[PDB]
Amino acid sequence: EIFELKAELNSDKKEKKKEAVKKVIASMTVGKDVSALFPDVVNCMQTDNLELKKLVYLYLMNYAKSQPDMAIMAVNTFVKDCEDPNPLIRALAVRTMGCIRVDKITEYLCEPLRKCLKDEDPYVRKTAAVCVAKLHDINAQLVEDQGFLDTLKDLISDSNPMVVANAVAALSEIAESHPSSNLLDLNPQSINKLLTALNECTEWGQIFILDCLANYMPKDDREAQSICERVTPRLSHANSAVVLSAVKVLMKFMEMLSKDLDYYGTLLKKLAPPLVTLLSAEPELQYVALRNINLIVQKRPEILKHEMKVFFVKYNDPIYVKLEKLDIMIRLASQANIAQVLAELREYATEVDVDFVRKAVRAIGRCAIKVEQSAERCVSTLLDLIQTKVNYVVQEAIVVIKDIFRKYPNKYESVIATLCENLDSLDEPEARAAMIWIVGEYAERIDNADELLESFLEGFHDKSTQVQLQLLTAIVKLFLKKPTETQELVQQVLSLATQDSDNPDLRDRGYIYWRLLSTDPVAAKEVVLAEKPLISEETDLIEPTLLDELICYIGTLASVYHKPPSAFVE
Amino acid sequence: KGENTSLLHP
């Protein structure tokens, strides 16, 4: 096996050497540690066959970190191959030189990198730029000493527009890891030159060209208008990444754009068709498109005001896609499409996904809370969900009713009777606590509030800390409102939470309630059963500082995670 | 494979 392979590789037969190389490659791909045979393959490295040279280079790259000492016998071979007349051989040698993670290997490759920097072949130029970028990433000091920054900067204003895009991407990557000192920012002539070559760049070069404009900050309306006009044709590109980059560039330029000028209106009008096209992309890019829309939704919510039909979750859409669609609908919910949102939530509530049903219920509750015009519709939907005879659906409806009562309880007295007998046997803490709070605060439209609280008082001392606190608060409120039928209930609750309750916070609350009851029962109505102010709902919109930063970082991993770029990298 | 082997090898 190993001995036979070594003997075959140490022979003068080309067919046997090729067979040995193929066997080694297959073993390496299958999960075989072929690094021990790297020194044997070092001698059989300078071969005329291009297939064997590629395999040898791949083995050296994959066996360079494992055996750095044995990699010292390939510097001469790399130097010889760097002057190969065939452009493919030169490109492969340049890629292998930058792909070898050797501290002492890149030092001797500086001369080949400098020689290949001025390569006339656009593929050779791109390979040299990639090797320079890799060397700078591995050793920034070595790249600075070699003076590759000047060569990279001059590559942008040269021919080979794909090579120019590769050099621009390499320079941006070097500056991305740089501490921002001596940045490669260009004047408007550089931006115009990049835009002129943008139409001649390939699909990969378009992203690199648009990335440079993402860091540039326009300072004049005419320059911003020209940039927007140039990026407008990029919105008609089949590449999803190119379209996303163009949208991000347009959003960044809109920060300095003037709303009085018609350029902003034209950009907003042309952005909606792009968002609609992106919403119908592949499932892998669907999440990215949804995240980009959500990030740009907080910036220009009027761009997608009429984009509501496409926000509906399809039957074959994935769980992540359905969640993103529901989030977009919740963020894009409006009174104009309130009926459509309610119908989608009702339709989405009939699915078999428990998480999907909970998300739909939460979205319906958020829409009902945000828009008071659909408060009656939200209450009716919650009542229908409760009557649907679903444990999760019933719990979601109870939670929504409790949230609405704390937010809009002025006209919530018509659901107390319906919610009084609504399969209250559920032991879910979120639903039980919400029902207890609703009964305590709304203990006016129900004549059996004490009877209903009697069943929940059987295990008050061992139900839960939050549940026990809610039950005690409800009992105190009932005693303050109607103490004739709850005089004994209040005393029993105080005894259970004061003597049989070992919770520190619960014990303190019970002691405070007992002291208030024994000091001034009349004052307890104005102290305990007081009119609370308007509840300040938590705003889902991100901070303006984060929104501006997220606008520049469009299409990155941070946009999908909804986190700052420095808060997600390691 | 590993399935045709005897459980106890007896």
């Binding site: - | 590993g2 399935e3 045709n4 082997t5 005897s6 459980l7 106890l8 090898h9 007896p10």
Partner: protein, 142 residues
């Protein structure tokens, strides 16, 4: 008594299952998955004894397919291993060179042998020849 005895392969496939405690189908599936994960996530020097859910989760597989037992903490741990070894020997004698492939094809025979050997999680046939003779007589009936 043995709460549940299930034979699971190394890859996670279950070749046998016999629970003496009435549990929900979803709960039983979750318990089986947890037992497989614990056995699949346990080394060979763990003593073959796991105290999961207050149950003597004893895992001892002599081949690629492993076996798991769940008994209460009221008897010696070696008794479960001895019972498992005796059952494996009885199954091998009844079948002859028992392998993973034969277990899948003989699932009904294995279930019948397990029922005739241990009922309700307790030992029913202390001898090894009497149980084999009874199984052979039952099979010959038709």
């Amino acid at each position: 008594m043995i709460h549940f005895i299930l034979l699971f392969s190394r890859q996670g496939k279950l070749r046998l299952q016999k629970w003496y405690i009435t549990l929900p189908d979803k709960e039983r599936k979750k318990i089986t998955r947890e037992i497989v994960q614990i056995i699949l996530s346990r080394g060979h020097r763990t003593s073959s004894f796991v105290d999961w859910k207050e149950l003597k989760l004893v895992y001892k597989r002599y081949a690629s397919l492993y076996f798991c037992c769940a008994i209460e903490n009221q008897d010696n741990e070696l008794l479960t291993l001895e019972i498992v070894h005796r059952y494996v020997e009885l199954l091998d004698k009844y079948f002859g060179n028992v392998c993973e492939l034969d277990i899948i094809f003989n699932f009904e025979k294995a279930y019948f042998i397990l029922d005739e050997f241990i009922i309700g999680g307790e030992i029913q046939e202390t001898s090894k020849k009497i149980a084999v003779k009874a199984i052979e007589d039952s099979d010959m009936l038709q």
